[PDB]
Design a protein around this ligand. Structure first.
Ligand code: H25
Ligand code: CA
Ligand code: CL
Ligand code: CL
Ligand code: NA
Ligand code: NA
Lengths: 44, 234
């Protein structure tokens, strides 16, 4: 169930089937595809 | 933002600022993608003509990474009215695309059902903007952020002079002197989940700022995820 540890998903969870925001690919975990993926603070 | 702290470099990169013909900021926004900014519908009434500045952390110094964008299309929720402040949401399509960089990057849009069960149930979110730093004072020349706890809808209703709708939620503090304020409207309320920030709210309204027994009221973005998606494809 997504109700326990978010189904182990790094981002989205539905019924387990994980999802990621646009700009990420499913590795559970979600992997950024660029230097400025959504929702990430930026470093110099 | 009353209380809180200044945003450090790269800390609040999805912040946008709406600027009027005087080149002064009057409302915030949230960067959604290269072409789209999320803001409050009520902001559109404040200036006939406005532009969007991204990358700014200090409105008194021109610094590396600031850029100005013209708005091509304004998409204002058809049900918004000043009578109720309900449906307080608009999307702006820019004329030219934003280049993401230090201090300029989008917040993530969540999936609706997941956001309702997983984000709206977190303890706190983060609000940011260049608004007043005291209810009676002047707008901040520095970008500020503030962690605000989600507030129980029924406590909020009891505290409020005005109707709280299902398209709103409440956040902030009963008596602690920290809150969003005039000028912060339209800006981001984001919620972290496992190292990623998702946009959960739009700064909407409050009875003053940081008043004892009052909270901040935010547009509930989950209620509009489908409306936003449709708007960004229009
Ligand atoms: O008009 C103001 C002016 N305030 C707006 C400023 N505060 C804020 O914008 C916020 C405080 C906390 C958040 Cl979040 S936004 C204060 O500096 C002064 N506030 C306000 C109160 C109520 C209100 N409202 C709510 C429901 C129905 C009708 C309606 O008018 C709208 C509104 F802007
Ligand atoms: Ca600046
Ligand atoms: Cl309602
Ligand atoms: Cl007021
Ligand atoms: Na809660
Ligand atoms: Na309060």
């Amino acid at each position: 169930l997504c109700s326990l540890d978010n189904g182990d998903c790094d981002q989205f969870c539905h019924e387990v089937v994980c999802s990621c925001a646009r700009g990420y690919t499913l590795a559970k975990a979600c992997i950024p595809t660029g230097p400025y993926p959504c929702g990430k603070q930026t470093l110099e | 933002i009353v209380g809180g702290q200044e945003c450090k470099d790269g800390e609040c990169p999805w912040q946008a600022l709406l600027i009027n013909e005087e080149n002064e900021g009057f409302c915030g926004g949230t960067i959604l993608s290269e072409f789209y900014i999320l803001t409050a519908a009520h902001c559109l009434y404040q200036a006939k003509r406005f532009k969007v500045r991204v990358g700014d952390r200090n409105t008194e110094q021109e610094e590396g990474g600031e850029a100005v964008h013209e708005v091509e299309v304004v998409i204002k929720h058809n049900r918004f009215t000043k009578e109720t402040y309900d449906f307080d949401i608009a999307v702006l399509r820019l004329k030219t695309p934003i280049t993401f960089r230090m201090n300029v990057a989008p917040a993530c849009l969540p999936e609706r059902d997941w956001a309702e069960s997983t984000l709206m149930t977190q303890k706190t979110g983060i609000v940011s903007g260049f608004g007043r730093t005291h209810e009676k004072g002047e707008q901040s020349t520095r970008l500020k952020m503030l962690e605000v706890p989600y507030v129980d809808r029924n406590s909020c209703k009891l505290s409020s002079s005005f109707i709280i709708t299902q398209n709103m939620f409440c956040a902030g503090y009963d008596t602690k002197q920290e809150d969003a304020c005039q000028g912060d409207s339209g800006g981001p309320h984001v919620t972290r989940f496992k190292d990623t920030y998702f946009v959960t709210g739009i700064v909407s309204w409050g009875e003053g700022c940081a008043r004892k027994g009052k909270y901040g009221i935010y547009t509930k973005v989950t209620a509009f995820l489908k409306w936003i998606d449709r708007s960004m494809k229009t």
